[PDB]
Design a protein around this ligand. Sequence first.
Ligand SMILES: CCCCCCCC(=O)OC[C@H](COP(=O)(O)O[C@@H]1[C@H](O)[C@H](O)[C@@H](OP(=O)(O)O)[C@H](OP(=O)(O)O)[C@H]1O)OC(=O)CCCCCCC
Ligand SMILES: CCCCCCCC(=O)OC[C@H](COP(=O)(O)O[C@@H]1[C@H](O)[C@H](O)[C@@H](OP(=O)(O)O)[C@H](OP(=O)(O)O)[C@H]1O)OC(=O)CCCCCCC
Ligand SMILES: *[C@@H]1O[C@H](CO)[C@@H](O[C@@H]2O[C@H](CO)[C@@H](O)[C@H](O)[C@H]2NC(C)=O)[C@H](O)[C@H]1NC(C)=O
Ligand SMILES: *[C@@H]1O[C@H](CO)[C@@H](O[C@@H]2O[C@H](CO)[C@@H](O)[C@H](O)[C@H]2NC(C)=O)[C@H](O)[C@H]1NC(C)=O
Ligand SMILES: CC(C)CCC[C@@H](C)[C@H]1CC[C@H]2[C@@H]3CC=C4C[C@@H](O)CC[C@]4(C)[C@H]3CC[C@]12C
Ligand SMILES: CC(C)CCC[C@@H](C)[C@H]1CC[C@H]2[C@@H]3CC=C4C[C@@H](O)CC[C@]4(C)[C@H]3CC[C@]12C
Lengths: 40, 40, 517, 517
Amino acid sequence: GERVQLAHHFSEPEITLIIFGVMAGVIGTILLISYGIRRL
Amino acid sequence: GERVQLAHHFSEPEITLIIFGVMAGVIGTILLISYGIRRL
Amino acid sequence: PLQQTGQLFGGLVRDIRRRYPYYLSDITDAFSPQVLAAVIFIYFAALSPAITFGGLLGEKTRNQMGVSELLISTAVQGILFALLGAQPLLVVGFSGPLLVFEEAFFSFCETNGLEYIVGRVWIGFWLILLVVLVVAFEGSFLVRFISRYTQEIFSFLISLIFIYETFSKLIKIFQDHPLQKTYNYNVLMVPKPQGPLPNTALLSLVLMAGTFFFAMMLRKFKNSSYFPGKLRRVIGDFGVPISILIMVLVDFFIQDTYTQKLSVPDGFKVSNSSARGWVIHPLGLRSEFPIWMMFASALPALLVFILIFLESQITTLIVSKPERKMVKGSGFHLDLLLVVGMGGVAALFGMPWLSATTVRSVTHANALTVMGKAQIQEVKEQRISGLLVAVLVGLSILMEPILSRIPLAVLFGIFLYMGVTSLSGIQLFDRILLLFKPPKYHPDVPYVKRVKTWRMHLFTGIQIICLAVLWVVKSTPASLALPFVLILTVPLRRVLLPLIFRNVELQCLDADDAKAT
Amino acid sequence: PLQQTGQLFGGLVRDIRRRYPYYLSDITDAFSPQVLAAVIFIYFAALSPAITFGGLLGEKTRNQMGVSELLISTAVQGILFALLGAQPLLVVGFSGPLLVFEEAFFSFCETNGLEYIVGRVWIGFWLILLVVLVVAFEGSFLVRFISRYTQEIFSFLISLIFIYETFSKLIKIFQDHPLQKTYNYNVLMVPKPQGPLPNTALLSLVLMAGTFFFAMMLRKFKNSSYFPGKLRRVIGDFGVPISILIMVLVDFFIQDTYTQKLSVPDGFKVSNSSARGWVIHPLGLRSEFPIWMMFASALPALLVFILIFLESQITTLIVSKPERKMVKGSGFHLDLLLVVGMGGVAALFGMPWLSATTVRSVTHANALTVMGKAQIQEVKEQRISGLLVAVLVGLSILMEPILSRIPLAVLFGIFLYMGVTSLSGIQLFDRILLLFKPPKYHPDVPYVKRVKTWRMHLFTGIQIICLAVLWVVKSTPASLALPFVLILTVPLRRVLLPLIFRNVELQCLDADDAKAT
Ligand SMILES: CCCCCCCC(=O)OC[C@H](COP(=O)(O)O[C@@H]1[C@H](O)[C@H](O)[C@@H](OP(=O)(O)O)[C@H](OP(=O)(O)O)[C@H]1O)OC(=O)CCCCCCC
Ligand SMILES: CCCCCCCC(=O)OC[C@H](COP(=O)(O)O[C@@H]1[C@H](O)[C@H](O)[C@@H](OP(=O)(O)O)[C@H](OP(=O)(O)O)[C@H]1O)OC(=O)CCCCCCC
Ligand SMILES: *[C@@H]1O[C@H](CO)[C@@H](O[C@@H]2O[C@H](CO)[C@@H](O)[C@H](O)[C@H]2NC(C)=O)[C@H](O)[C@H]1NC(C)=O
Ligand SMILES: *[C@@H]1O[C@H](CO)[C@@H](O[C@@H]2O[C@H](CO)[C@@H](O)[C@H](O)[C@H]2NC(C)=O)[C@H](O)[C@H]1NC(C)=O
Ligand SMILES: CC(C)CCC[C@@H](C)[C@H]1CC[C@H]2[C@@H]3CC=C4C[C@@H](O)CC[C@]4(C)[C@H]3CC[C@]12C
Ligand SMILES: CC(C)CCC[C@@H](C)[C@H]1CC[C@H]2[C@@H]3CC=C4C[C@@H](O)CC[C@]4(C)[C@H]3CC[C@]12C
């Protein structure tokens, strides 16, 4: 980073991987729900 | 005229009348000569 | 292109199936001098808004986002869009609504003790989720309900705003260096002159007017009957580069008088190294980013998604009209995905999200448009021009010794040319001109020969009221509501207009392909 | 008109019989707004050369003849010519060659210790003799040997010189007030600024360009399809007055910057009251005028007669072309008599002799020309417009508060408009433009469809050689030999051209009425 930055438990790659993983889970849940609807 | 002007024997109208009369005489002489030619 | 398949990401797959087969032609069709002249034109047309908006953004956000971030984001997103996009003729860059949103969000973060750049990171994170879902469910099929009505209202409004801002820049130049009887001959010049200077405003006016005059004259000369046709068309294609060169030389040979020049940053470095780095931690830089703002970022993400979606999709509608002779296809789903996803990713680097700007894209399409023996014959649909424009924008920092000698007034004349020439294909501008003509001089078009004159004038006047309403909204603090007021025109055409116009009148006046019903 | 009757004063009598029946129409035909717009146009077009040439004349002759003398001579001769001439559309005034002759004669009198004004009186005395003899013997029938060749060479050269002088005036403005980094804010302004001033030259260029722009745009608007036709034609008629008014208002609302304004003398008085009065004695003012110079004044009188004769008769030929739709007739013998006799009489009063100026008269004819629905429909032939122009020139001293707020730069733009619009009827200019067009774009005219393209270009380039030779003569001390070099084009057309061109080619190219051989 720049100057002095607060130290977090997750680093930038770790935190962005976590965020992208949660986003992918949300997208997959939405797509599976849409797949379940319009069929029954 | 203006300022101090040289004194002439003829004033401005007199001299311009003399000059116009001379010019008219010359023009009339030329026209009468032209009338004489192209006839004999 | 706007049909709904019903299959997840079906619209995305169709757009790639439509345009990527032409990828080989997208490289070979660029081998013409008109493409190079378009590169030189759109380079300045894209660099100058980048520099101006970067300066304004750095002023308004304490340089947390500035010129260098904007230039790098513009270059990278333009390169990736030209390499992968389905409508390569779009020009991707920063815009006025995005600047207003950045101002509002910085003010909000200042009020609530939030880090503005980390908030932007989370807005970008929510933007990726939105555009994936919209593309997944073919949400870009809703663009089919934006008829020529809304398209032309938006296009005419954006062109008018562009011309107004171009003239206001010259007005500001005249205000900063007014015509005075006496001047203080000892004025500090760094960073900018601290007082009025002689000859500056008048020379700026002369440069702008001369650039506009030369551009219009060479545009006329292109269609003229002078010179061999090949040489004439070559000079006509290079009309804007030749005008810029002539006026830049004129200013270069006038040494004593000061004129404002282009100014790029020294190097590829963050505008404030004391604030942030190249990568912003989503959890915070100085303070911990609160959890509630991680979820509350969806609403600004919704607003930014709406702004980018409306701007880019309407621009794609305008540039891909059937009457512009675009025979290669455009992808509404793929371009939306690329633009919004690239913006969301760029937010992670503290770099701006971009949009398909209307004036720049229309100017790019017109510069690549070939005119036959009048009538549009073809368009040089290729990916090399946009890629080269983006590359030159990225290299703008390194070519400072050249950009530092180009006055802003010359670029103002170029902007005036862009604004006036962006009005050619708009039927609203044509019908406004019919208000000032006798009815016997009206052209043989379906909306003249099949519609009564006062009925057509009433239809045009209703659009002018929409233009005034949208213009008022922009000039208010609620200028981020402009996309919604523009959206309101779609019910106006589809619900209210049939109450006062017949179907044949509406088909003649609002036709997707300029047809006679 | 150009036939020789063989009776003394036959052409003079025929001109009186041809035109004076139309005298009632020559007054009633001026009841239209177009004539008023023409009056406003030609008033400035005649006043500004009068002031400029009078100032130069006073500088070069120590104010023996100056601005007031030229204004009074212009007014009186214009009134008399409009009331009595057989071509009232001619504008009578001072020209460059007359100024050159005045310079040379003043230098001659200075070298020999002769009174310059008395020598002018005797030159005017000999001028009356020459014109009476020429009119008596119908000497104006030699104008029939001046074909479209010599007419168009003369007209194109005079238009080129007019445009060049208009641009050189702006160059002189820039030289007087150069663009500098620093100026001395304390500069004495009376009588004229004694040092460079800021913002002056650039504003002068802006005013000139704006006046030219508005004039050309209003001329285009006249032929346009906008507005009701009657209002559109009225606004197009007043295009030059409207442009002058707009730019004068623009300069008026700029208080701080200096621009050079129109300057007329305080009253109707001689420029140098210590040199001469209103009436100059033919025999001498201070010293007795020598008798030998009374007879030796014939040679300068012959030179002046040749200058005035060629200028006036070629102007009458150009304005009264059969293609310009003049259906009222023109008198070559009467107009020459009036102009030269009035010049001789004005010599007696220390006033300049004048000539039928080319650009001024062509501008006067074009301002009164009515266009069809492209095609010249008719001409507002009348005596009122020239009479009113001369009356306003005479009253220009009394309306100093109006003229003192009119910049010369606005008049420079009007002069540029006059120069560019004076090229419309010249086929030499049309063929010069065909040197830069493909032959497939050449118009359907007899000299194109009946002559090979390279033959027409050879004929055109021969005329360009004549133009270059004439231009070289103008830029030499022997510029008074220009009429003789111009007359030499008549042997070139009637002798040397048939050696390299066929009869049919010459008939198609050099045609008296633009007919297909
Ligand atoms: C600097 C250029 C070279 C200078 C050397 C000067 C020597 C020189 O250049 O002559 C060759 C050429 C003559 O050949 P040519 O008249 O046949 O050339 C035609 C011309 O190019 C047209 O523009 C073309 O139509 P378009 O536009 O495509 O619709 C037409 O093609 P097409 O469509 O009918 O099949 C061409 O045939 O020049 C000229 O064009 C005349 C104007 C020259 C003006 C003089 C140059 C200013
Ligand atoms: C400020 C003026 C007040 C305007 C009040 C606004 C109300 C208003 O003025 O319209 C009514 C009237 C319509 O009447 P109309 O169309 O019949 O008038 C025709 C028109 O004047 C043409 O120019 C004429 O042809 P040209 O040119 O000679 O060849 C033609 O004469 P003709 O030869 O065919 O027999 C005329 O018939 O005017 C307009 O022309 C529309 C222009 C609207 C534009 C008005 C924009 C201000
Ligand atoms: C870079 O960022 C720092 C900190 O964000 C800015 O320093 C601030 O400057 C403003 C303007 O006076 C004031 O709030 C304080 O002086 C500073 N605050 C803090 C917290 O440091 C600095 O101005 C920025 N640099 C630029 C060029 O804008
Ligand atoms: C008016 O005319 C007089 C002479 O008639 C001029 O006076 C002369 O000025 C020149 C210029 O220096 C010199 O020859 C003498 O100083 C004067 N000579 C005589 C005989 O008077 C006077 O300059 C003229 N006025 C103007 C404004 O030029
Ligand atoms: C739509 C995009 C932005 C993802 C959705 C955001 C929500 C659902 C998720 C994504 C990543 C998540 C965070 C990941 C890491 C941590 C650090 C931990 O000590 C507290 C919870 C916290 C702070 C999570 C809170 C909820 C969170 C912000
Ligand atoms: C064509 C016009 C100018 C006429 C030609 C000029 C000749 C023929 C005439 C015109 C007027 C004449 C002058 C009239 C009066 C006088 C005064 C006299 O004491 C001496 C001779 C003198 C000075 C004359 C000399 C000749 C003269 C100059």
